């Protein structure tokens, strides 16, 4: 298989105008579950999730997220009192794991305050990295509970990966298909690719035999139909002809377009 990932995000907003809590799960780029403080229900965001998970799953996790929502509100209260901040501020959490092609795995868990890194977990040293002293105070409390850290490591390395495999099988028709890119060159040379899945794609320009960087890269954008599009541009020297070629790598296939 290609590289896949599972990550769950939580957002807390302290003085919302708009939910004060949101939690969404992804497999790769695909939303799979959603919850917010308005609906107070955990719901599938993909047909192959709804199809494969019984009502007791959604019932159980609905209850857990109602609790997590409260814990998030309280932690947000503590961070703002300590930063001595007034007004609306945000608190975010990201957890998840990757299953790489070679079978190796990664695992990560992080927190953010106003969209900046706050606490980053290290499952190998069983420790927390703090970006400032408010974060340092929390670190010391969290690190004093050894069992919780150990719990975090086990979940990231085993449970997260097992969940990910389960979801991969649920949505294999979606997650494991390949739609190769359509690639053309426009004229300043633009190399355009579209209609491809997965979104991971590598586009670059070469001048003669060396990788040219003076290249302008377009972002990888959703086309709204489940496929993606992107581009990369370079500027042609007006005074000396060169051999320019667009190179595209996508799902183990390399492609060259010479001009």
């Amino acid at each position, epitope marked *: 298989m290609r590289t896949h990932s599972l990550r769950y995000f939580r957002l807390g907003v302290s003085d919302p105008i708009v939910p004060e809590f949101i939690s969404v799960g992804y497999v790769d780029s695909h939303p799979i579950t959603t919850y917010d403080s308005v609906t107070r229900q955990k719901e599938p965001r993909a047909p192959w999730m709804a199809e494969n998970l019984a009502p007791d799953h959604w019932e*159980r996790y609905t*209850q857990l997220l*109602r609790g997590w929502q*409260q814990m998030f509100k309280v932690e947000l209260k503590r961070l703002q009192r300590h930063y001595n901040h007034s007004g609306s501020h945000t608190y975010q959490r990201m957890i998840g794991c990757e299953l790489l092609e070679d079978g190796s795995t990664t695992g990560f868990l992080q927190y953010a305050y106003d969209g900046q890194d706050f606490l980053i977990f290290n499952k190998d040293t069983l420790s927390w990295l703090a970006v400032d002293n408010v974060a340092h105070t929390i670190k010391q409390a969290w690190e004093a509970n050894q*069992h919780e850290l150990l*719990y975090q490591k*086990n979940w990231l390395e085993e*449970e997260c990966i097992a*969940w990910l495999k389960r979801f991969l099988e649920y949505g294999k028709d979606t997650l494991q298909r390949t739609e190769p890119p359509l690639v053309r060159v426009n004229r300043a040379l633009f190399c355009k690719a579209h209609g491809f899945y997965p979104p991971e794609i590598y586009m670059t320009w070469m001048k003669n035999g060396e990788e040219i960087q003076e290249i302008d890269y377009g972002d990888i954008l959703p086309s709204g139909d489940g496929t993606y599009q992107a581009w990369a541009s370079i500027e042609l020297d007006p005074q000396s002809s060169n051999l320019y070629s667009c190179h595209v790598e996508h799902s183990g296939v390399h492609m060259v377009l010479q001009v």
Partner: antibody
Amino acid sequence: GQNIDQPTEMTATEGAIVQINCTYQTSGFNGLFWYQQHAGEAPTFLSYNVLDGLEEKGRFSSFLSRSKGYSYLLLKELQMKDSASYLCAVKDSNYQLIWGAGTKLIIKP
Amino acid sequence: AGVTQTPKFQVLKTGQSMTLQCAQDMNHNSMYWYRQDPGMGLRLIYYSASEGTTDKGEVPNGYNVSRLNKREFSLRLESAAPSQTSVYFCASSVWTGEGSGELFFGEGSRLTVLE
């Protein structure tokens, strides 16, 4: 998960050592707890394992093998007050607790 | 004080209503009601993940509950049955979901239901 197994009853001698087994077959794993319950009383927390290994805490030790799906509670230098039931509990993938039927430990003075 | 539940003992005739009380002064978010019967492990009746929500456990039939506030979680027997003869345990934890958090148990309530 599905089930937790621990022996119904164990009898050992004062001063000696006893090892209480707990095997689990569960849907996912988020930790194994041991609780002590004296006859007619509330169970109370003894230990927690989630990664492989042995964790010591006084006369009591706790072992875990995730791959073998078993844990044991080790009691050294047994005293009469260790007479109690010991309850094994596992947290599954959905953070729900599955409880063993308990092991009643009897100490011969 | 920990977890306080009442009554310590109770006799009930078949068909009778009953309410078990439980409070915890540890500012815990999660509370639970279990029953303990000979030859089997604790079975969850109902639980409350945090203030404001409750849900069925493994054996909800015959029972219902109320998370009255953050401290209190009472268990109700609708129409007492002989099979509901048991020892009932209230428990609480700081937060369910937190993987390594232990339960704190109350002293138990011994119920005997007779025809």
